[PDB]
Amino acid sequence: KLRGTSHMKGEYPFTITDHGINIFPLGAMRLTQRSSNVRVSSGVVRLDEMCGGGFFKDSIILATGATGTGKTLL
């Protein structure tokens, strides 16, 4: 509590490092990430084709599969 004003509520994880206390307000991060149309290669050309010309530079790509399928190769 802080009588008189507002503040974020709840618990926030933090780490004590060589630079002292470091807190990550993971719920304070805003949904304002920049978004372009720029592409980039996967390291696999055919893949790039399938993806309509490569992964977007601004993107989160996820490779899922069973153990041994080759995520680590990609």
Ligand X SMILES: Nc1ncnc2c1ncn2[C@@H]1O[C@H](COP(=O)(O)OP(=O)(O)OP(=O)(O)O)[C@@H](O)[C@H]1O
Binding site for a copy of itself (CB under 8 A): 1, 3-6, 9-11, 18, 24, 26-37, 40, 44, 46-47, 49-53, 55-74
d(CA 64, CA 74): 11
Q: Are 27 and 34 in contact (CB under 8 A)?
A: no
Both tokens of 25, joined, read 């307000």
Min separation Cβ 20 and a copy of itself, Å: 12
Binding site per annotation, positions for Mg(2+): 72
- Interface residue list for ligand X (CB under 6 A): 1-3, 5-7, 16-18, 67-73
